[PDB]
Amino acid sequence: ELELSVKKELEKILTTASSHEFEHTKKDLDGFRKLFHRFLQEGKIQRPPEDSIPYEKIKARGLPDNISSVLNKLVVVKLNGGLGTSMGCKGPKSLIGVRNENTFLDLTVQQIEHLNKTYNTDVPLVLMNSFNTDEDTKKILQKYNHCRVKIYTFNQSRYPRINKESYPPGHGDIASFYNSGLLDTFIGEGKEYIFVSNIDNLGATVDLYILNHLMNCEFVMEVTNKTRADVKGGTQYEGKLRLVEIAQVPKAHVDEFKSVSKFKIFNTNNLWISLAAVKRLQEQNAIDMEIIVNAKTLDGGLNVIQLETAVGAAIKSFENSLGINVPRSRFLPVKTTSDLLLVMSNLYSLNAGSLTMSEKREFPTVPLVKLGSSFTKVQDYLRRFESIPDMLELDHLTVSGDVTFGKNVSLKGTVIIIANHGDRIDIPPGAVLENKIVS
Amino acid sequence: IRQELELSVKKELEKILTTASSHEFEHTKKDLDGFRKLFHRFLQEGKIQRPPEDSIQPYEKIKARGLPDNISSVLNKLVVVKLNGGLGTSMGCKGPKSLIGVRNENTFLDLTVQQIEHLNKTYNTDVPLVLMNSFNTDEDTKKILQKYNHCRVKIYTFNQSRYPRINKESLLPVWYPPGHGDIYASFYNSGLLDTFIGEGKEYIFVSNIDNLGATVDLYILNHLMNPPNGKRCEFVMEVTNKTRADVKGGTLTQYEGKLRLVEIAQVPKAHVDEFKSVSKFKIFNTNNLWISLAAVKRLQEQNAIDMEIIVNAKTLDGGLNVIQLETAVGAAIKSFENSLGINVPRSRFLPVKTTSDLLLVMSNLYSLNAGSLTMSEKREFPTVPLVKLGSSFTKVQDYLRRFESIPDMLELDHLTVSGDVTFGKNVSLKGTVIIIANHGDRIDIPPGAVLENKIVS
Amino acid sequence: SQFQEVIRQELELSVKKELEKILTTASSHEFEHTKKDLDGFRKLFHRFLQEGKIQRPPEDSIQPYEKIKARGLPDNISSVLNKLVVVKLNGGLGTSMGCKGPKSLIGVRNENTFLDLTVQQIEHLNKTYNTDVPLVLMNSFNTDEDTKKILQKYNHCRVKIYTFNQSRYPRINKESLLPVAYPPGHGDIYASFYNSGLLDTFIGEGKEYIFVSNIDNLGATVDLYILNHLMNPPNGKRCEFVMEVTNKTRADVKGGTLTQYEGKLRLVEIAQVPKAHVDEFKSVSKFKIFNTNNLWISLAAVKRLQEQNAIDMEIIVNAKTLDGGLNVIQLETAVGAAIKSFENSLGINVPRSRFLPVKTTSDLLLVMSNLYSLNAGSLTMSEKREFPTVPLVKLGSSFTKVQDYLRRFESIPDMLELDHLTVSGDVTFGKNVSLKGTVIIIANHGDRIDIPPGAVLENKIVS
Amino acid sequence: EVIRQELELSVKKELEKILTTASSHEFEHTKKDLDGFRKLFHRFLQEGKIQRPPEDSIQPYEKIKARGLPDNISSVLNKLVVVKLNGGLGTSMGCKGPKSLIGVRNENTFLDLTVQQIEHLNKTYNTDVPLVLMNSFNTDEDTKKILQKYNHCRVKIYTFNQSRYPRINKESLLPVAWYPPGHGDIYASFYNSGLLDTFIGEGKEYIFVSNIDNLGATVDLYILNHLMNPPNGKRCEFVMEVTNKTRADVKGGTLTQYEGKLRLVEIAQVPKAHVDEFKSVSKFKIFNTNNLWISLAAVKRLQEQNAIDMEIIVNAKTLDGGLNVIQLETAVGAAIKSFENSLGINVPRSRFLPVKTTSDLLLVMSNLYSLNAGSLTMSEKREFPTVPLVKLGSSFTKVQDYLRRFESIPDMLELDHLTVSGDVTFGKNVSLKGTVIIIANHGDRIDIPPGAVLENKIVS
């Protein structure tokens, strides 16, 4: 008698519709009911064997020659649903400057343009944007016409927040793909596959070595070795491969997670998913994704629980799955302005829209940089540099305080600069900082 | 001309050779004439040689061949020689570097013999230890040896030669050790060479006492004593990958059928850029070498030991620029028939140059097993953490003063301190720690504190 | 006498009329109890206008708690509680501490508020004793309307919670002697509690004794031994009015003491003490006795004395200035000075287990440390804390407002081995700090100090 | 009047009890030095405005240059003698011994350079010009030691010492404690050394007195063409190089036509009232360079006559554990007034470039200037011709410090003002441009990064 009083106010929100909106109105609610019923009804015994999961072994099978073929039976979807307010800039996380002078969105059409103009193929790109991103990104999709690209944008369902005392439904909502109708469209043409990559990941290009094991199974989940850097994240139970998340872990076995190995598994969020298998699961309602609590409180109101599902959670529902190892070449997500300084450096070379780590960086290791609190805002980031320094021979960089960089600087080895509170530190142009502590 | 000003520097030492203290005469004549013998070669003083994939072998291919059975093995073919001719004033200490404490507190010397004991006291064998110490270190090291009686290890000493500090502007003499190439002649001349080959030992294993990871390894020894169907070995060179940590050293190449050594100075100007990547040079001179005893006798008799002349500048401290003619051990493989060096894990090369290495190596990051220490887990990534202590921390006494115990490091990646900083008991460093106390200020870090990804100003 | 008692009469006449004015002001149908309130002011005022040294206190009038504690506890049933009334003093906000609201609603431990811990205490009586103790709160216009909306949380519990408001009085002028168009303190209780129609309800329900304490005193708790002493008393005397007293620390010389004046007890406070002998009050101790404001009072006794106007309490002056205004007086009274009027009145000397005023954040810390343990809503110093010694904690002005206090300590540090603490300026503690010995943490203007998580500061001066 | 002769002959006998303590052979020079004083003290006891200097008596170097060069051969050099002023240490720069011996570039010492010059002269021209050094009791034996090194360079070198005088006391008026009596003491010493008669015997006719600070003191052919084979007939005798005043160099010496001849004037000689008009109004554009051209012939003629008129420079000095005392001296320039036909010629600042302090060094060992065969001249592309202004602090004063602070001399072509003070260091390959102020307050350090370009900046 305690779920029958929330649904009665979910019937009291249908008559507050603006007459026209009724097609996707009675449906988005009827999804919340399918997941609110799983809220109040809520191993270790199997470890992943050798016969399940390497990169350099597929390359020796290895590459189908040549045109195309095969490049024509595929669709490319990159995620959008997400602001970059954490970055600073109000608006979609797609519309921020990366390399002079392209943005995330620009970098993606750059990649597709090179393949179309060389393999004679026409591969359509797709955005899965949220309600906070569609108004803006739609207005700028006009500057992409007359480029050899097909474009297909569509929204995600709207979900009602609920209160602790008495929002986007996560990235796993891709429920929506059948709702817009493009599911039925894409299949009935010749395509058989969908490639999901995040837009934050800039290494997540479409691979031709993997397109061998795909073309001429079904479900591919890409993986990379865990590193001290990124500890928490997603990692074969009872026949099928099951996704395991940080929050699902019982109280006892927290020490067993992370340490040691044990596990090498990490969630890449780069997936290939078969089209014809979606309709065998989306219609019979057998997709089993796990739903997470995710209750924050911002800014000056009660604690709110926002229920969301995960993309990689539907392996337990898919049949005949197997994952393959992908070297860190093809995983490079950008989160803070400290990543921006990294990627826009002469650490990466730029080639037809997709970027790779450069020569001659002698050792193949990312030199990660920690920028201070006063660099977090992208508008402040560019203020303080403009003239992204030389970093081909840098190992560690840490700046904190009111610091400014002149043009053409070179950073080498370990550089530490720390201005005290209400001090300014002005690095002169052309300067070469090598293993130095600038207080 | 070049002779007529060389016969001056030869009759300039005839005045000091009569300034000889009766007995100490023949080991004085022997050296000074061996100084002339270098000075001569000093006046006269590729590339097509790309290194081969057959001589230089991976460790992984020896280690699993593999274990020599049984009793035992023989091992009684080996001699462990360790270089002990180095002062430790860069670490702060007046005297031999060997006598600096590393753990609990075993000294450098302590730790070696504790290995040789665990061998002999488990394999019913008698392996010797041989130290080469120069005139700097011989005195002080001898007095502190009486503590090793009734340890199952026979220990032997012999001195490096004594050459004159020649003048840059003057090219005339007024004292230094000729490096570590001097071994071949000074080890023969002591008499020890003939002893060991007389006991039937045929293989000597040189290394640096600095290299705490330089441990006697069975798997390699098996490749040597009773070798794989073939000939060899007159000489072996342990060699590791190049790290950003150490960009200048030696590289081993194949110039003219035999493998040569190349030093950074031997490089003419229009090719210095080329050395150390393009990465067709991931060879690093570890300085951990095996040699054959039988081999040394032959080649030393006929002066058939060819090394490149090292020419070091220093004017330090007060006075004119000084010229030190030296020779290295490596620069003499090309004069040994049939050479090959193998590739070795960095596990086997852990040299303790600064006070910053001490920290690393006496932390809970390494676990000790009576002498020989290893990178013991829990440790997640294999990566060696960066540690850079300031100038307030160089002299050992200061370093030891500053730490009231050595802080936990098993989950550290980078740590940099500078200033008058001072630690506590049970301190736990995790992530990237930066602690900097400015000219006049002092930071003392409270006991049992956990600094994790922080910056203390 | 001649020219002095004409002016005095014209003062009491002038105000009265400017108060006959502020009566119909005010022309609100809801008169209850306005006219009475203003008849209480003129009673105080008339006294203010018209307006030692004697003996030390006798050795049988004040008694040690151990003598009484060991007699010992009642036997039946008991069921001696059924003649008791607990009364908590809720006339006061926490704007001192810095909180929008009644002090009675700030959280202490895990994280129950002063009043939570109070009802948890009574619940636990009634539960283990199949008894029904009534709880009364004597609050003010400041405190009532706010707490009433919350009192519905204590539903389904085993308490009957009761309320009343004590009067409003208007604040008189220090220059002009004129009312501006305040709660007269805890001393007003007698009148207000009776007028509220509760004194009579309970007397006619079989109660005989009232236990008055503060809400700020987390230690002031119902004690079966001191209860045994009034209910079924020794010999048959028959008292009436009993006031808990303690021994004076350096911590509190500025309090009130009991002394025999002309044949009865009287509470003598800092203020009424002559200019020449102010020192001899503080020392020697000697006068080692100090008022706790834990009181036990007979209900029968109130009526007899109330309905007959005879509770003689000393008048306090209390000059205040706030905010952009000149000087205003304010007339108040104190429970304690009532002893004077009662009969067979006596005081018992108490441990300080029973006296913990949570007045500052300094006090809060201590009381949410590991230096105490919470059991059924009451808390007491806990073993193992070896030396019985009580630490002294002085926090800085940066720690005054509770909202700050919480954020500055990521956790509550381990105490138990504190002797002295003194923090002043901009500091901050992390998770799992352990403090022992004497800890001094001074940070100057413009500086920060962040004690890292897990630190153990023993006898250090951090700067 | 009668007291003066009393205090003048009291001095006579007091010195007479000091000869009686002279080491056998030292005497014949010690006495002549002491009779040198007798005369100066005698002048010192007995001790405008109409002076504004004419047109024709001071000439612009450009006219002279355009006449121009000697033809034969020349080999006009044969009649010249180069004299460089040595007496004078470099303790104010933070150096022991002779200032002559400080490293300027490569490092060539001050003296390394002037021989480097004379030599290149003799070698290109097949002539053998001599270098004579006038050092004093402080910079003599120290210099002679180093002279061994110039063997087998093509320069005959010489030395002589100027006199040594007694320090007389402020209150007492008695002598004590010895000093070299100014550079003006060149006429007397040069005569007594005998070189003067020696040289006028080998048929030399002229000396070129100049200073070893002066790096710009080139031997210039056009001035020579004017002295040997003079145009028109006359015939003079004394020539004073002379330049323009900068706000920099205002308090100097200027020529004026006092009573017939030219006469030098020093700020110390000017009446209190008129001090404002000397040192501007310019008016006095002329400023003394102390590069002089003098006839050997003429010296001798007038020295036998004791006719050389200099003014007494009265000096007050008391350092460090001494008491207040006077130190009577004379100036070389001062002597125009007694020579004949004397003229001054105005000369580019190129010829005038003294390195008196550590600021100056930085400037001269820059890439602003350029070095060839010992001589150095500013050069390209120093586009706007003006000389940049450098004020290093009291930290950079000592030569030994100055070098430790500059891990490399920095670029200065584009530099207009540089001013530092406090505890500062410089990386290598620094470039300075425009106006650069770097100021480090007591207790601080500024370390400039290598490769830095400071362009119009304040670094505090």
Query: Is A335 assigned a catalytic role?
Result: yes
For chain B, how big is the Rg over CA atoms in Å?
24
Of A335, A370, A407, A436, the active-site residue reads A335
Closest CA to B204 of B183, B178, B227: B183
Cβ count near D7 (within 10 Å): 12
**Which residue reads 């060992």 in tokens?**
D365
Subunit contact B450:C451, Cβ cutoff 8 A? no
Q: Measured between alpha carbons, how far apart are the two ends of chain A, in Å?
A: 65
* Type of residue at C201: T
Cα–Cα distance for residue pair C439/C415, rounded to 1 Å: 11
Q: How far apart are CA B232 and CA A257, in angstroms?
A: 50
Residues C378 and C117: beta-carbon distance below 8 Å: yes
Output the DSSP codes for B67-100: PPPSS-TT-TTEEEEEE---B-TTTT-SSBGGGS
Burial class (CB in 10 A: 0-12, 13-18, 19+), C254: exposed
Query: Phi, psi (5° rounding) for residue B103?
Result: -165, 110
CA dist A14 and A5 (Å) reads: 15
Catalytic positions of B, please? 353
Q: Reduced to 3 states, what is the DSSP secondary structure of residue B169?
A: coil
DSSP assignment, residue B352? -
> How big is chain B, counted in residues?
457
Measured between alpha carbons, how far is B207 from D140 in angstroms, rounded to an integer? 60
Cβ neighbours of residue B17 closer than 8 Å, sequence gap 6 or more: B28, B29, B32
User: Nearest Cα to C188, choosing from C291, C315, C101?
Assistant: C315
Q: Are C235 and C83 in contact (CB under 8 A)?
A: no
Torsion of CA B419, B420, B423, B428, to 10 degrees: -10
DSSP state letters, B276-314: S-SSS----EEEEEEEEHHHHHHHHHTT------EEEEE
Chains C and B touch (3+ CB pairs under 8 A): yes
3-state SS track over chain C: CCCHHHHHHHHHHHHHHHHHHCCCCCCCCCCCCHHHHHHHHHHHHHHHHHCCCCCCCCCCCEEEHHHHHCCCCCCCCCCCHHHEEEEEEECCECCCCCCCCEHHHCEEECCEEHHHHHHHHHHHHHHHCCCCCEEEEEECCCCHHHHHCCHHHHCCCCCEEEEEECCCCCCCECCCCCCCCCCCCHHHHHHHHHHCCCHHHHHCCCCCEEEEEECCECCCCCCHHHHHCCCCCCECECCCEEEEEEECCCCCCCCCEEEEEECEEEEECCCCCCHHHHHHHHCCCCCCEEEEEEEEEEHHHHHHHHCCCCCCCCEECCCECCCCCCCECCCEECHHHHHHCCCCCEEEECCCCCCCECCCHHHHHHHHCCCEEEECCEEEECCCCCCCCCCEEECCHHHCCHHHHHHHECCCCEEEEEEEEEEECCEEECCCCEEEEEEEEECCCCCCEEECCCCEEECCEEC
Backbone phi, then psi, for A107, in 5-degree steps?
Answer: -65, -30
Q: Is there a binding annotation on residue B208?
A: yes
Q: What type of residue is D392?
A: L
Task: Output DSSP code: residue A230.
Answer: B
Contact partners, residue C275, CB within 8 Å, separation at least 6: none
Secondary structure of C25-70 in HEC code, one letter for each residue: CCCCCCCCCHHHHHHHHHHHHHHHHHCCCCCCCCCCCEEEHHHHHC
End-to-end CA distance of chain C: give it in Å, rounded: 65
Closest CA to D395 of D432, D429, D446, D354: D446
User: Which run of H or of E encompasses A276?
Assistant: helix A275-278
Going by their DSSP bridges, the two strands B428-436 and B408-418 should be labelled as parallel
In this structure, what DSSP letter does residue A92 have?
A: B
Long-range CB contacts (within 8 A, 24+) of D440-449: D443/B439, D443/B440, D445/B439, D446/D422, D448/A428, D448/D424, D449/A427, D449/A428, D449/A431, D449/A432, D449/A433, D449/A436
Contact present, D292 and D239 (Cβ < 8 Å):
yes
Helix ranges (DSSP H) in B45-174 = 59-62, 108-123, 138-143
Domains recognised in chain C with CATH numbers: 1-358 (3.90.550.10), 359-463 (2.160.10.10)
Element (H, E) at A25: helix A25-36
D80 burial level (CB within 10 Å; 0-12, 13-18, 19+): buried
How far apart, in Å, are the Cα atoms of D418 and each of D362, D363, D430?
Answer: 11, 10, 13
Q: What dihedral do alpha carbons D93, D97, D99, D101 form, nearest 10°?
A: -120
A neighbour chains, 3+ CB pairs within 8 Å: B, D
Structure tokens at C442: 């001074």
**Are the C-beta atoms of C410 and C431 separated by less than 8 Å?**
yes
Tell me if A355 sits within 8 A of A252, measured CB to CB: no
Radius of gyration of chain C from its Cα atoms, rounded to whole angstroms: 24
Please give the backbone phi and psi of residue C116, each rounded to the nearest 5 degrees, phi first: -60, -60
Question: For residue C79, is it left (φ>0), alpha (ψ between -120 and 50) or beta?
Answer: left
Torsion of CA D43, D45, D48, D54, to 10 degrees: 10
CA dihedral of residues D353, D354, D357, D362 (deg, nearest 10)? 30
Structure tokens at C113: 């508020």
Give me the residues paired with residue A127 across strands.
Answer: A78, A153
Report the residue of D414, D429, D453, D456 to disrupt the A interface, i.e. the one with the largest count of A CBs within 10 Å. D453
Find out whether A241 and A323 touch, Cβ atoms under 8 Å: yes
Cβ-based neighbour number of residue C21 at 10 Å = 12
The β-bridge relationship of strands A125-127 and A151-153 is: parallel
Check: CB of residue A173 under 8 Å from CB of residue A309: yes
Q: Is the peptide bond before B378 cis (omega within 30 degrees of 0)?
A: yes
Q: Output the six-digit token pair for A380.
A: 């402040």
In the DSSP assignment, the letter for residue A252 is G
Query: Whole-angstrom Cα distance, residue B323 to residue B310?
Result: 10
User: Shortest Cα distance from B438 to chain D (angstroms)?
Assistant: 10
Q: Which long-range contacts (CB under 8 A, 24 or more apart) does A48-53 make?
A: A48/A236, A48/A241, A48/A265, A49/A236, A52/A236, A52/A241, A52/A322, A52/A323, A53/A223, A53/A322, A53/A323, A53/A324, A53/A325
Residue of chain A whose alpha carbon sits nearest to that of B280: A362
Number of residues assigned to chain C = 463
Which segments of C are annotated as binding site for substrate? 91-92, 186, 214-216, 293
Which chain B residues are within 8 Å of A256, Cβ to Cβ? none
Q: Strand B450-456's sheet: what is its strand order?
A: B386-389, B408-418, B428-436, B450-456
Q: Which residue of B425, B434, B450, B451 is the best one to mutate when testing the C interface, meaning the one whose CB has the most C CBs within 10 A?
A: B450
Neighbours of chain B (3+ CB pairs under 8 A): A, C, D
Element holding B101 (H helix, E strand): strand B101-103
* Contact residues, chain A, for D453 at CB < 8 Å: 406, 428-430
The DSSP secondary structure of D292-306, one letter per residue, reads EEEEHHHHHHHHTTT
How many Cα atoms occupy the beta-carbon half-sphere of B145 within 13 Å? 15
Please list, in sequence order, all residues whose beta carbon lies within 8 angstroms of the beta carbon of residue B361, skipping any fewer than 6 positions away: B102, B103, B212, B350, B352, B373
Q: Which amino acid is at D409?
A: I
**Residue A237 pairs with which residues in a beta bridge?**
A240
DSSP conformation letters of A339-354: HHHHHTSTTEEEETTE
- Under an 8 Å CB criterion, which residues of B touch C? 428, 445-451, 454
Residues 6+ apart with CB under 8 A from A104: A93, A94, A95, A96, A98, A199, A200, A202
Chain D contact set for B439 (CB, 8 A)? 443, 445
Q: Give the three-class secondary structure for B32.
A: helix
3-state class (DSSP) for residue A144: helix
Distance CA A122, CA A71 (A): 9
Strand pairing partners for B330? none
Distance CA B17, CA C118 (A): 103
How many contiguous H segments (helices) and E segments (strands) does chain D have?
A: 11, 23
Q: Is B327 left (phi over 0), alpha (psi -120 to 50) or beta?
A: beta
What is the number of other CB atoms lying within 10 angstroms of the CB of residue D88? 19
Measure the CA–CA gap between C360 and C394, rounded to whole angstroms. Answer: 10
CB atoms closer than 10 angstroms to residue C340: 18
Q: State phi, psi for B132 to the nearest 5 degrees.
A: -105, 105
DSSP for D81-118 reads EEEEE---B-GGGT-SSBGGGSEEETTEEHHHHHHHHH
Amino acid found at D371: L
Q: Find how far residue D228's CA is from the centre of its chain.
A: 24
Q: Do chains A and D touch (3 or more CB pairs under 8 A)?
A: yes
CA A365 to the chain's CA centroid: 22
Q: How far apart are CA A398 and CA A393, in angstroms?
A: 15
Q: Which residue of chain D is at minimal alpha-carbon distance from A424?
A: D460
Question: Residues of chain B whose C-beta is under 8 A from some C-beta in A?
Answer: 244, 277-279, 377-378, 380-381, 383, 386, 388, 413-414, 416, 418, 432, 434, 436, 438, 455, 457
DSSP D205: -
User: For the CA atoms of chain D, what is the radius of gyration?
Assistant: 24
Q: Which residues of C are annotated as a binding site?
A: 89-92, 103, 166, 185-186, 214-216, 293, 359
Dihedral, CA of residue A305, residue A306, residue A307 and residue A313, to nearest 10:
-120
At B165 the three-state DSSP class reads: coil
With a CB cutoff of 8 Å and minimum separation 6, the contacts of B240 are B284, B286, B343, B344, B345, B346, B348, B349
- Residue D273: phi and psi, rounded to 5, are -60, -50
Tell me the C-alpha distance between A85 and B280, whole Å: 47
Burial (0-12, 13-18, 19+ Cβ within 10 Å), A12: exposed
Q: What angle do CA A101, A107, A113 make, to 5 degrees?
A: 115
CA distance B440 to B319: 35
Cα distance from N-terminal residue to C-terminal residue, chain B: 65
Name all contacts of C24-33 with Cβ < 8 Å and 24+ positions apart.
C25/C181, C33/C167, C33/C195
How many CB atoms are located within 10 Å of the residue B49 CB? 14
The tokens describing A265, both together, are 């598994």
Residues C167, C37: contact at Cβ < 8 Å?
A: yes
Please answer yes or no on whether B448 and C455 come within 8 Å at the CB atom.
yes
Q: Where are the alpha helices (DSSP H) in D95-214?
A: 110-125, 141-144, 187-192, 195-199
Q: How far apart are CA B28 and CA B161, in angstroms?
A: 9
Element (H, E) at A321: none
CA nearest C399: which of C426, C418, C420, C433? C426
Sequence letter at residue C41 = F
Q: How far apart are CA C265 and CA C55, in angstroms?
A: 10
Q: Which residues of chain C come before a gap where C and the next N are over 2.5 Å apart? A: 51, 181
Distance between CA atoms of residues A362 and A372, nearest Å: 28
Binding site members of D: 85-88, 99, 162, 182-183, 211-213, 290, 356
Query: Parallel, antiparallel, or unpaired: how do β-strands D103-105 and D108-109 relate?
Result: antiparallel
Residue identified by tokens 């300026």 is C425
Distance between CA atoms of residues A242 and B89, nearest Å: 60
Known binder of ligand: residue B211? Answer: no
Tokens of B296: 């040394």
Technique used to solve these coordinates: X-ray
- Which tokens go with A240? 């099928």
H/E element, B237: strand B235-239
Q: How many helices and strands (H and E) does chain A possess?
A: 10, 19
Is the Cβ pair D452, A429 closer than 8 Å? yes
Q: Helix, strand, or coil here: B414?
A: strand
- Residue D454: which of D422, D430, D427 has the closest Cα? D430
